[PDB]
Amino acid sequence: SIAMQTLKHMPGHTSREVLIIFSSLTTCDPSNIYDLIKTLKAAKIRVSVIGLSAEVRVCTVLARETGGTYHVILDESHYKELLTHHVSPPPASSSSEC
Amino acid sequence: IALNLKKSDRYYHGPTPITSQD
Amino acid sequence: VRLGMMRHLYVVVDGSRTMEDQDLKPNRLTCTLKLLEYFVEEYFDQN
Amino acid sequence: LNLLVIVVDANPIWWGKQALKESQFTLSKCIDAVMVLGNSHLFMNRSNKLAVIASHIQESRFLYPGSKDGKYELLTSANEVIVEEIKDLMTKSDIKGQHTETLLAGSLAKALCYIHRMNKEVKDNQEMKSRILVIKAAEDSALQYMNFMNVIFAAQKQNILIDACVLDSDSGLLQQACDITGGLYLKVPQMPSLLQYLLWVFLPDQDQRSQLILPPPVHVDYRAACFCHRNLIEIGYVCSVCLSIFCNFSPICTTCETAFKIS
Amino acid sequence: MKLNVDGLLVYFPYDYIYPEQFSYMRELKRTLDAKGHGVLEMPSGTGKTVSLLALIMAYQRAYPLEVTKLIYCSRTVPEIEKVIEELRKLLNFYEKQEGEKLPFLGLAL
Amino acid sequence: YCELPVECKICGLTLVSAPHLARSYHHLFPLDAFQEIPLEEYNGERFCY
Amino acid sequence: YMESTVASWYEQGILENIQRNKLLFIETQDGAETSVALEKYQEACENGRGAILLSVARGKVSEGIDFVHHYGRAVIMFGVPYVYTQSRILKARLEYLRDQFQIRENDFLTFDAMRHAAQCVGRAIRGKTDYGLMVFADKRFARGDKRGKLPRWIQEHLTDANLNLTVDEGVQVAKYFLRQMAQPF
Ligand SMILES: [Zn+2]
Ligand SMILES: [Zn+2]
Numbered sequence: 001s002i003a004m005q006t007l008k009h010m011p012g013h014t015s016r017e018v019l020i021i022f023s024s025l026t027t028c029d030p031s032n033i034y035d036l037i038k039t040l041k042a043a044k045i046r047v048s049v050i051g052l053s054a055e056v057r058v059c060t061v062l063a064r065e066t067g068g069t070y071h072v073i074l075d076e077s078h079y080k081e082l083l084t085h086h087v088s089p090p091p092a093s094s095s096s097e098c
Numbered sequence: 099i100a101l102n103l104k105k106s107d108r109y110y111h112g113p114t115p116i117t118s119q120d
Numbered sequence: 121v122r123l124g125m126m127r128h129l130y131v132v133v134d135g136s137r138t139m140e141d142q143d144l145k146p147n148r149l150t151c152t153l154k155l156l157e158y159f160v161e162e163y164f165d166q167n
Numbered sequence: 168l169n170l171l172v173i174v175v176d177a178n179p180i181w182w183g184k185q186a187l188k189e190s191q192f193t194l195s196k197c198i199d200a201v202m203v204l205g206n207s208h209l210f211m212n213r214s215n216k217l218a219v220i221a222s223h224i225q226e227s228r229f230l231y232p233g234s235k236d237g238k239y240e241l242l243t244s245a246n247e248v249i250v251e252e253i254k255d256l257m258t259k260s261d262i263k264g265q266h267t268e269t270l271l272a273g274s275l276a277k278a279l280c281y282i283h284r285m286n287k288e289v290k291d292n293q294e295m296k297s298r299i300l301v302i303k304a305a306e307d308s309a310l311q312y313m314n315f316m317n318v319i320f321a322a323q324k325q326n327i328l329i330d331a332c333v334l335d336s337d338s339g340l341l342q343q344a345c346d347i348t349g350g351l352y353l354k355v356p357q358m359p360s361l362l363q364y365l366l367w368v369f370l371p372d373q374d375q376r377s378q379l380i381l382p383p384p385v386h387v388d389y390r391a392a393c394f395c396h397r398n399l400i401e402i403g404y405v406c407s408v409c410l411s412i413f414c415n416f417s418p419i420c421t422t423c424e425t426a427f428k429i430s
Numbered sequence: 431m432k433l434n435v436d437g438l439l440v441y442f443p444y445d446y447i448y449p450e451q452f453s454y455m456r457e458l459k460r461t462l463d464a465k466g467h468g469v470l471e472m473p474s475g476t477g478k479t480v481s482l483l484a485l486i487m488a489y490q491r492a493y494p495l496e497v498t499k500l501i502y503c504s505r506t507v508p509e510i511e512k513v514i515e516e517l518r519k520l521l522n523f524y525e526k527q528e529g530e531k532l533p534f535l536g537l538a539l
Numbered sequence: 540y541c542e543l544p545v546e547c548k549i550c551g552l553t554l555v556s557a558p559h560l561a562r563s564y565h566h567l568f569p570l571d572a573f574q575e576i577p578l579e580e581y582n583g584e585r586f587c588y
Numbered sequence: 589y590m591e592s593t594v595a596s597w598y599e600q601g602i603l604e605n606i607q608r609n610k611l612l613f614i615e616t617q618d619g620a621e622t623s624v625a626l627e628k629y630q631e632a633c634e635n636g637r638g639a640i641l642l643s644v645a646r647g648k649v650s651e652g653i654d655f656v657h658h659y660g661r662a663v664i665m666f667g668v669p670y671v672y673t674q675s676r677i678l679k680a681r682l683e684y685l686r687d688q689f690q691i692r693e694n695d696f697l698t699f700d701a702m703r704h705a706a707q708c709v710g711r712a713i714r715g716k717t718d719y720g721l722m723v724f725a726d727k728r729f730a731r732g733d734k735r736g737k738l739p740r741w742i743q744e745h746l747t748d749a750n751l752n753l754t755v756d757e758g759v760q761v762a763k764y765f766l767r768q769m770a771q772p773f
Contacts, residue, residue: 003130003132006130007128007130010128013126013406013407014126014127014128014407015124015126015127015128015407016127016128017127017128017129017130018129018130018131018132019129019130019131019132020132021131021132021133021134021152021156022134023133023134023136023138023139023148023152024134024136024137024138024139025638026609026610026636026637026638027636027637028636028637029635029636029637032635033635033636034634051770052143052148052152053143053763053766053767054766054770055766055769055770056636057633057634057657057658058634058635058636060658071770071771072767072770072771073144073767074767074768074770074771075144076144076145076151079144079151079155080155083155083156083158083159084159084162086159087159087162087163087166087167088166089123089124089125089127089166089167089563089566090123090124090127091099091121091122091123091124092099092121092122092123092124092408093099094099096099096122096124097428098122098406098407098408098425098426098427099121099122100121100122101121101122101123101567101569102122102423102425103422103423104421104422104423104424105421105422106422108394108411108422109313109394109411109422109564109567109568110309110310110312110313111309111310111312111313111394111397112312112313112316112392112394112557112560112561113390113391113392113397113399113412113557114309114312114339114340114397115309115392115397116309116397118264120180120183120184120187122408123408123566123567124407125407125408125410125563125566126407165324166562166563167563277588312561313561313564313568316558316561316562316564317565319558320558320561320562343558347558389556389557389558390557391556391557405560409567410560410563410564410567412557412560471739471740471741473710473713473741474713474714474715475714475715476714476715476716477715505651506652508654509654
């Protein structure tokens with residue numbers, strides 16, 4: 001939400017994105033994340049989660065529903081590889097406009 | 099959305115602008 | 121495939137108790153931050 | 168360790184015109200000056216290493232991979248192999264009226280992958296500093312811009328200094344290549360004294376370059392222009408797909424014709 | 431997906447199935463072939479269910495004179511509701527594989 | 540301004556140098572993969588080009 | 589034992605540390621209360637909060653609930669589930685099986701304990717090819733006879749490296765397994 005309150009005012013031509021480095025699988029929340037997820041899809045904010053030693057449900061749905069990807073650190077090389085992969089520009093979705 | 103192009107040669111130059119015996 | 125040339129990205133990092141855990145060889149907080157400095161530089165270096 | 172790669176613009180049109188012009192400076196004496204620089208560079212330190220490449224309108228060729236005269240075999244053999252390799256390029260070369268622009272991007276590409284190969288073959292016990300000295304003389308081509316930019320950023324990424332020692336034609340991208348990579352650029356007015364510029368300005372390596380006074384780099388005009396008219400402009404309209412500088416708003420970009428919407 | 435089961439070629443909806451499913455089916459077939467009861471264990475629910483239905487349906491289609499009806503029982507109604515939907519899916523595949531409707535009826539009580 | 544590229548602090552418009560754009564054009568010109576020939580395949584070029 | 593255990597954990601910091609680390613729910617004989625708690629447990633698992641469910645193996649919830657990915661991803665069994673052997677129902681049943689069907693008292697009693705344990709614990713795998721963990725906190729299960737009474741698929745996946753793990757070793761092997769399961773096939 002703090003990111004969305006910032007990225008919502010961004011122009012439409014720019015790819016709005018968020019990279020989440022998730023460490024502790026438990027995370028407190030003041031409201032149902034599904035509404036926020038639906039809002040992220042509507043806000044066209046690409047969200048991709050990277051989980052460290054955790055395969056979380058909310059991160060799974062958040063990524064795949066938003067179109068982003070959720071990955072988990074297999075080892076240091078996997079972590080290096082995943083961040084290196086995220087450096088690539090995002091491939092345009094059929095829902096994305098120029 | 100696959101990549102599409104119509105006139106790609108223009109990319110090769112960018113802003114760059116534009117006797118046989120010799 | 122078509123690629124989004126201009127992109128705005130926010131990096132979200134946990135500051136929770138598990139970051140102090142030595143989950144990898146180095147301290148997870150140290151490891152993640154050290155590798156993020158590389159990723160941040162490469163992010164601008166490629167875009 | 169220091170690795171110095173010398174790139175010679177051995178374009179037979181320009182050097183031939185200079186020969187026909189009865190120019191005082193000539194490619195032979197230029198290659199000879201390059202030879203002295205290569206020798207003196209290796210002569211400066213045991214760990215110093217070098218490579219030399221010459222370019223032609225068709226392609227580019229490498230000039231570099233007992234003591235009968237009472238001197239060291241490496242220097243003597245380096246001189247002989249360079250002379251033989253340049254003569255092979257000049258003798259084994261076709262003639263074509265349609266193609267005259269000198270090749271540079273391909274020469275730098277081979278040098279960079281060669282440097283990378285050397286960067287792997289070098290023992291990690293020692294660090295290797297690499298620099299490329301570009302000796303341009305003949306006109307560049309617009310088609311080279313894209314490919315030259317690729318090697319420019321690769322050199323910057325891999326921390327290779329591009330030092331430009333221009334003879335005649337000043338390529339705007341070449342003066343940009345050095346600035347982007349942090350290398351120096353100079354155009355010699357006294358071509359016969361080219362070797363003095365090499366030994367005073369281009370001979371010192373980055374560590375020496377920092378502890379020394381050299382003329383400040385020439386101001387670089389980072390021109391920008393629309394791809395439709397190629398005219399210099401301060402404001403251009405790019406798109407998040409073609410990333411091409413257009414002259415004005417259009418519902419479809421001529422390079423892709425994607426369905427943009429009025430706004 | 432035609433399965434080369436011991437007794438007959440069995441039509442199956444999924445293009446890929448795991449090796450243990452073939453064993454379970456050809457093993458269970460022994461009860462039909464021997465005309466007698468038996469016991470067996472298989473971890474997966476859906477896999478053993480769909481393979482069971484495929485096997486028994488193919489066997490019933492092959493030997494309707496030998497086996498008139500199939501009686502299936504499961505722990506609870508919520509499970510039964512899913513199983514009967516899997517049978518419908520199998521019948522939908524079978525109808526598509528056959529290309530025509532057949533005189534077959536199945537229901538959950 | 541001392542450093543580019545940057546967004547205008549006033550106009551809210553991006554200021555950038557032409558090479559910065561070309562730094563992304565490799566995404567627009569993806570390089571075709573070279574076919575593998577792990578065996579020597581009688582290639583007379585002992586030296587890698 | 590569950591309440592005694594929970595009460596002991598409440599006197600200690602254990603119960604606070606657990607709840608602080610993740611929400612916890614406990615099942616009871618009440619179908620409505622357990623249904624609500626289970627729905628809240630599942631809803632907690634949908635959100636970032638996550639939840640922990642404590643239940644009695646013989647409880648109606650264990651025979652009725654189905655475990656799926658992120659809904660009972662790991663199942664913990666505390667001890668071999670043996671029913672109170674003084675209960676008259678068990679006495680009549682067990683002596684009849686020995687008198688009529690000749691099955692030994694400890695043989696059938698262990699068989700029913702092994703069966704009920706596997707039933708409650710094996711439900712972690714149901715379909716859709718989703719991973720699950722099954723940790724048994726009792727060296728009894730590692731005994732040669734108990735191993736043979738354990739189902740073949742569990743028995744063959746079980747191995748000496750995970751047959752007599754220390755609590756720490758279990759957490760370490762679980763963390764590794766989770767890391768290995770998160771990537772696609
Ligand atoms: Zn466009
Ligand atoms: Zn115009």
